């Protein structure tokens, strides 16, 4: 599923991301834009052999199992394919764990490089929320 911007914002809000760990909804929408272009099916292989999965590009070395990432953990206790669903529940649940890990949203490189410090509230402007 390719979400619309406001559609994603609404879904993230219902599933409890808005202000989660102090990160406003705009931060999470911005992160998804630059991680996946709002595409739940997005996958990208990293140089270390791990792969990033789904709307928030959650990585197989620490958080999910894809069966092909040597010496990795599955801290979200989910198959990585569960992060590709049109239903964002598994991605949201796992992202909550990630953002609680110690470095906050800096765990998402695209968030650090493209969202952090910017006018992130623009990502939810005009949305019925
Ligand atoms: Na893993």
**DSSP sequence for 38-51:** TBTT-EEE-TTS-E
DSSP string, 83-117: GGSSS-HHHHHHHHHHHHSSSGGGGSHHIIIIITT
Q: Which helix (H) or strand (E) holds 52?
A: strand 51-53
- Quickly tell me which residue has 């952090």 as its tokens: 116
119 marked among binding-site residues: no
Residue 32 neighbours by CB distance under 10 Å: 32
What kind of experiment solved this structure? Answer: X-ray
Catalytic residue status for 7: no
127 C-alpha to center of ligand 1: Å? 36
- Report the sign of the C-alpha dihedral through residues 114, 116, 119, 123, in that order: positive
Residues of the domain holding 111: 1-129
Listed as own residue / partner, the contacts of 80-83 with beta carbons closer than 8 Å and 24 or more positions apart are 80/51, 80/53, 81/53, 83/53, 83/54, 83/55, 83/56, 83/58
Q: 23 — phi, psi (to 5°)?
A: -95, 110
85 C-alpha to center of ligand 1: Å? 18
* Total structural domains within the chain: 1
To one decimal, the resolution in angstroms is 1.2
CB 54 within 8 A of CB 36: yes
List the CATH number of the domain containing 51: 1.10.530.10
């Amino acid at each position: 599923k390719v979400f619309g911007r406001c559609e994603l914002a609404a879904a993230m809000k219902r599933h409890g991301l808005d202000n989660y760990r102090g990160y406003s909804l705009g931060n999470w929408v911005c992160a998804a834009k630059f991680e996946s272009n709002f595409n739940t099916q997005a996958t990208n292989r990293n140089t270390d052999g791990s792969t990033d999965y789904g709307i928030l590009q959650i990585n197989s070395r620490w958080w999910c199992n894809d069966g092909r990432t040597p010496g990795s953990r599955n801290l979200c206790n989910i198959p990585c394919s569960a992060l590709l669903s049109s239903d964002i529940t598994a991605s949201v649940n796992c992202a909550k764990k990630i953002v609680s890990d110690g470095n906050g949203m800096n765990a998402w490189v695209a968030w650090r490089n493209r969202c952090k410090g910017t006018d992130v509230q623009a990502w939810i402007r005009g949305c019925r929320l």
